[PDB]
Amino acid sequence: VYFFDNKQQLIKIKNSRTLLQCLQEKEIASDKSDLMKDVLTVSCLHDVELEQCDFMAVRENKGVYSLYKILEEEIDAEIMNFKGVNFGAEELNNYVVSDARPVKKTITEIVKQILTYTDDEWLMTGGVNKIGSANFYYASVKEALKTVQQLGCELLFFCDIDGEGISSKWVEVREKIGKESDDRYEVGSTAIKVVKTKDRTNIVTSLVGRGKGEEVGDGYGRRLQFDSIEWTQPVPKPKGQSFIEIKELTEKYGIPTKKGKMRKREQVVIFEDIEDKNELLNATYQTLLENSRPLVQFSSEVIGASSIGDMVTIHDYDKNYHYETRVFAIKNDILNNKIESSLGDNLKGSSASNQLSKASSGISELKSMKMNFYDSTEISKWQSDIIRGAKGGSVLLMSPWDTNKGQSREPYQMVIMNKGSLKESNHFLVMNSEGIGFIDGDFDKDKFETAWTIDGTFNAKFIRAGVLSGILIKGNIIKSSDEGDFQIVLDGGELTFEKKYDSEDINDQHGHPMLTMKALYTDDKLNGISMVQIPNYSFGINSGGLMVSKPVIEIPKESTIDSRKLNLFGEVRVVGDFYVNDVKIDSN
Amino acid sequence: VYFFDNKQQLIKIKNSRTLLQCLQEKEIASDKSDLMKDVLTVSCLHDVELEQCDFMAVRENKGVYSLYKILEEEIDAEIMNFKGVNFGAEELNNYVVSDARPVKKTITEIVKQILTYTDDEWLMTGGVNKIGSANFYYASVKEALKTVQQLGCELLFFCDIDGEGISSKWVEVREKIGKESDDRYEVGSTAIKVVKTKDRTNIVTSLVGRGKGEEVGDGYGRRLQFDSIEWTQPVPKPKGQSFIEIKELTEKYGIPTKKGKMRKREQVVIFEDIEDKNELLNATYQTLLENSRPLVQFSSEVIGASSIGDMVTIHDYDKNYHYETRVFAIKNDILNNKIESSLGDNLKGSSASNQLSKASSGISELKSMKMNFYDSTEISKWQSDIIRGAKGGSVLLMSPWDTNKGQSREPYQMVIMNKGSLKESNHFLVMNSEGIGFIDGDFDKDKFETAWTIDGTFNAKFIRAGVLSGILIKGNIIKSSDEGDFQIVLDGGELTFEKKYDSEDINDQHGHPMLTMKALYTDDKLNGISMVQIPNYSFGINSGGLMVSKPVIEIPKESTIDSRKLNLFGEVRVVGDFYVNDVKIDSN
Amino acid sequence: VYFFDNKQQLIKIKNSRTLLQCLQEKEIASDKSDLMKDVLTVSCLHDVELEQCDFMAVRENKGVYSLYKILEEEIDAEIMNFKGVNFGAEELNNYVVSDARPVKKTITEIVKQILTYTDDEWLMTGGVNKIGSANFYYASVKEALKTVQQLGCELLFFCDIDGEGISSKWVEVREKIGKESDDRYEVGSTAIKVVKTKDRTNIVTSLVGRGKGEEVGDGYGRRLQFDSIEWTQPVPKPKGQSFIEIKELTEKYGIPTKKGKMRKREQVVIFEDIEDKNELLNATYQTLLENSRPLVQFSSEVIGASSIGDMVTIHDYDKNYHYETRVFAIKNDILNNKIESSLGDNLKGSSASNQLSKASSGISELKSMKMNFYDSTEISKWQSDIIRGAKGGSVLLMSPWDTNKGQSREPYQMVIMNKGSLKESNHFLVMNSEGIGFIDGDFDKDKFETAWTIDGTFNAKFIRAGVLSGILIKGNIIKSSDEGDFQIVLDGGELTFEKKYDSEDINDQHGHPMLTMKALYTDDKLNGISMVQIPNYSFGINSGGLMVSKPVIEIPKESTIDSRKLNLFGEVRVVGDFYVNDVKIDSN
């Protein structure tokens, strides 16, 4: 046993004539999410230059050495104990993966990508050709390797150690650990104390698959199922069924009935992250196939030496059974030449210590995979903001939070924009606490205009296209315009021909009258209708054409009540009474 | 001990002269959610034809047999070992219950309903008259029976076994297991080694109840309490208080004070699914009543034989105590005539193995009853959709998700319908990225018109009912119409009478002039008001009635500036000077 | 040993010549969230009057006594056993804190405030000057003290016990338990069996801190980090880095590389309730300083007597080491004068029982601090109601739930109010399933108007301010009014002067005609423009001023087709040929 100091430099060599204990253990875990266990324990007499050492290594052959790092020492009386684990499981826990996210790549490329964060110290050897994906964010490298291991790969670690330090390190990726060995164990000559165990707790013949939810929120707990999938060639499955059954397994492990017939065994299997149907069926089929036969375990003391993970054959001639199994646990005592092994399926996972470890890991996982009050509030806020329109399209309910991040989220106005989003649109229709208004080019709030007011006072200037029909007009003042200074007015049941004037008041629209057709309250009754004239103005009933207009009656500018100067022009044929002197007399 | 093969056919009988161990254990669990434990263990010498057996049974009396299913087997030193459990706890785990949901029914009917999923194999015997409800979805029958058992029933299982297989199976429902036996145990003659234990850990005299939330979201953690419920006859409880206290229990187990008085003990009890007040009070009262006395347990070796669940009486004359207890655990050894029993309240739930089992079950329950990111997102989406209007009432915000299910959830228009929902309404008011518009009968076809445009151009054709008053009209063109071809036009500050015409342009409304009362720019000043005429048209100031109007002045069709033929008609009284051959005249 | 009854009255004294066992244990837990352990165990021969006692006490010196409360009692064979804990840890579990919520106060004031719920039985002694805050709701006092202890204080409990009961109780608050003692332990003379353990499992040199989320909802898992904080004087930390590193620790405990250089060790530390950067950096620095050196533990059997928590010194001359450690566990045996102690850092937390207890506590905490279906639904409802406007501002989508609390949540109308909320505003713009309408002062009523209708029918009476221009008017009836009974009408392609009238129909607006400027269908062609008169009415073309208008032609009330009476007034100047019994005449 060679001991190294903190810089991995050789210090001392301990022989086999001084050590009091030397034990090495290896074990392949039942689950695929755990690494391979490797522990060494050595204890010798107390020394003063062995309390600074941090590494210890043993010998496999002339070219391969295994390195163990001390985790704990215990001086008792004068005997120093020690305890070590593999170097890789302790070194690869101090590299941080910021964020890595492959999508549908092979395992070899994923390992290449992960081992980039170790700064070229670690390499990799071997390959697998299965495609998978994962999301690695802030986490250690060992956890990432654990996650990769679940896809069907098994990992090891090695060194190239000399007396002056470590030179090269690499990681081997394989499918199954161990080649096939030419070993032969016989009970009574090579295997000494054989204990055979058989278990039948978990046996199924039919399973019902379930998926990742259908309509969550109703509370009815629906899940995706393979109800309407046809699948014939591997195992005949009908179209109206919802479970996979193997016939012969039912005949061999079924529940007998009254009539001598057999019935199947059905248990429910849940997959939390399956969204398709065919892959759910494949997963359920694999789960059914894995759990169809009882488990067998052999545990014994052996003479011949085998590595971990080989295939060996064990025989027993007195009771006449013959099996082929796979070594999965080895406890090698170097000092006393005693070797203990185990073959077959692993049933060591039901001991108390493993259960304690699994419970602690489960608590630690649940603490990080579930959502507390803050996360629920944040998710609700995000999903409400998505539908309110605060991130996308043309309809939006504004709140001060959308502008300052600091005030309340309470809405005070509703905005309909032109295109896209707030910065991508040019026109706005705003509904706020002042009335339905409009906003110009930019939403820096040029100035808010008003079309409707909340008390209900429409603004008339917004009528700019169309034809008006089918209504009544009353009380209003009408007017027209020309290039000169003449306009027609209808104010208070009056027709006014006057001169133009520009103003901003209802009363000030009226100008200087010249001719006003009207009516007069004639003698306490409204039976007088006539026009009027005004002096210094010309009036007429001019006749002719569009270019020429000659006076039928000419009204002078000086026409007055006193100066009744009733000019007339034009050849007029006057049928009716005529006047020269006194008394009416007829004509032509 | 009789051994059966995989089809429940008798194979071999083993005597008592060749067995090495036979042990049978029974135990009633402390909690009501666990079944009754039944375990048998037997070991004999190795045999070839015993490695295929799957059932082993023992004898109770001449008509009752108990059947055990082998779960494990272990050849160690040609000494085979077997371990078995009850058949019922293993067979009823392979029957899937899908979607069974009773509401407010009796336990007997619930068990009858559950046992219809076993295909007539299992029956039921007995009954309990208590009302309860449960929700069973995809799950096995055993878990359903476990859930039912929590409502105040206790279950057993039985068979009717013969040499050629099982004939009938049934499940018995009871209130308490065991009748009242006539047995008497005396210490020193019938009971050998007696160990008595007394516990005082959980002792209370007052409790404060809490309910299923009040206003969750504030984060203040309010809960429903019985603050304002009066309850007098069982135990006097005032109105202003929020806890139940029994006086004598306080006097007997109260904290002494400085003045020699006693104080109560208060602890908080939480019920997660209580929504009313009186039932919360009843539950708190029952919890208080249950936990008011210290616990006692007896464990001893017994000569006499009793079944499980009976009521036996134990006496001790030297120390002078006499108690009446209930048997709850029996460990019967058939081969050596040794019986071990326990009496009183169960305190076996604090051992390490039970704690490990409870921790595993608790973790597995938490993994299923708490929600991750996906469930929170789905619930938020559902609750946002409810309030957006996408499922119900008359105000709704459209998004592409509501029509095509594949695009984003971002809104782009707001729709107000007529009645009900999208398919139950005929008329629509729509405000989208092109202005306030309207939609006809069917919404599936856009057919979108516009009333307001986002730049603010109202369409005038939408004014169809009302009276218009209190505004000004300027610049606009006015027109009327009749059945014939006459209309009145006010264009450019002139009154124009023409012939009617139909057109679609502002300029084309004007027609063929006949008489245009207008004004003339008379000598660089606007003081000329006059009419005009046009040849080949008739003009007049006709006078008379509504039927008839005769010309005061008749304007001929040929009236012209050149041909000044101004025909006049009617009896006229022309007072004033006149024009006859250069003289002034008078009234004859 | 003195035994008390249920009222804490002395009953019996047991000497040292009758007891069979007496053992006292004390231990300081590794975590700061657990109290100080104190356990006593005594056993003696069975006595009749010792089965009612509930307290047993021992002697420290002539003035200090320790009180223990019996929890379990076990009569076995003829020897009674007992098991007691400290009085305080059992008494202070029966006082209920309703709600206390201090903010940024000192520990002394927090303890003072908490100890007001014991009704002046418990006092306080000592003090610590550090500022902290906590939120206490319904919970017992012991959990509150546990939570306070996490801020850097350590608690003890005491009594003033006499033969007639307890007189005064108090709690001492300290920062560290134990003074500095003048003790000297030498191996081989005063310490007998020394076992030393050194642990190196968790050693780090650099850490990466994380905070309380950044944008939860995207699913990317961002967290607050100290990326852009400069912090130099304690440890030089640059501006572009995301971790804190100590140099010399890396030089002493670093991973050696190929070229002889050393590398750092990084692990991720998560704080779930940190929102600022400088405090996150401080917490990470404190963790790094706490986890930088390996741990050492001494366990031995000593001769001299020391209290719990002192600082002693242990020496060993043969192996030449000298350490200064702190006592943390004492197991004093009173009957046999044997004392067993432990020194240094506590490594007793990895035993099986402690792990079981921690797992149970973790499950119980997770069950209470996570959210199930009901909580998620309630939070989503609250956060949707906040943004819908149902609590605050001036835009609101009202649903029947907002008024009756019992019906569904689907919205049926949208309301825009004036100010604040429903009760603080006067004018409303309501958009519902009937049309865009308005509501007067109070909203509790249903005085709903209708401007728009869903079929697109505007109401013309809502135009009340503005100027109308740029449109066309067609078909509509135009009218005016005056104080008298005259109005100008333009209906059916004609101009009508008539008498004013009031009505509510389109047809009834027309009145009694007087003068109707119109057109006549003159001989199958529309070339006739004419006016008419009506008998018993006066007509004229009056001329003059605004005050005076004299008839150019006077039309009498009796003017008729038969009674042609065309009165003319005013001195005329008439050029033309005239009618003097035929031919043609001259023109003055």
PDB file of C-alpha atoms in Angstrom, chain A residues 54 71 73, chain C residues 197-204 249 252-253 290-297 345 347:
ATOM      1  CA  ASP A  54      -4.403  12.066   1.566  1.00  0.00           C
ATOM      2  CA  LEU A  71     -12.159  10.599   3.798  1.00  0.00           C
ATOM      3  CA  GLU A  73      -9.169   8.555   9.990  1.00  0.00           C
TER       4      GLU A  73
ATOM      5  CA  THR C 197     -11.772  11.237  14.711  1.00  0.00           C
ATOM      6  CA  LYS C 198     -11.005  13.493  11.742  1.00  0.00           C
ATOM      7  CA  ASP C 199     -13.468  14.109   8.904  1.00  0.00           C
ATOM      8  CA  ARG C 200     -12.815  15.614   5.471  1.00  0.00           C
ATOM      9  CA  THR C 201     -16.031  14.962   3.525  1.00  0.00           C
ATOM     10  CA  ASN C 202     -17.155  18.556   2.865  1.00  0.00           C
ATOM     11  CA  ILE C 203     -14.232  20.870   2.054  1.00  0.00           C
ATOM     12  CA  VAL C 204     -14.590  23.765  -0.399  1.00  0.00           C
ATOM     13  CA  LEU C 249      -7.005  27.580   0.836  1.00  0.00           C
ATOM     14  CA  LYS C 252      -3.472  23.997   0.497  1.00  0.00           C
ATOM     15  CA  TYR C 253      -6.560  22.001  -0.582  1.00  0.00           C
ATOM     16  CA  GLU C 290     -17.556  27.997   7.875  1.00  0.00           C
ATOM     17  CA  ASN C 291     -16.716  25.105   5.516  1.00  0.00           C
ATOM     18  CA  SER C 292     -12.954  25.505   5.035  1.00  0.00           C
ATOM     19  CA  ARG C 293     -11.257  23.251   7.607  1.00  0.00           C
ATOM     20  CA  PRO C 294     -11.521  19.571   8.576  1.00  0.00           C
ATOM     21  CA  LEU C 295     -13.311  18.586  11.766  1.00  0.00           C
ATOM     22  CA  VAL C 296     -11.823  16.968  14.876  1.00  0.00           C
ATOM     23  CA  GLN C 297     -13.643  15.171  17.689  1.00  0.00           C
ATOM     24  CA  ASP C 345     -16.877  19.548  16.717  1.00  0.00           C
ATOM     25  CA  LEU C 347     -20.169  14.484  14.557  1.00  0.00           C
TER      26      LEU C 347
END
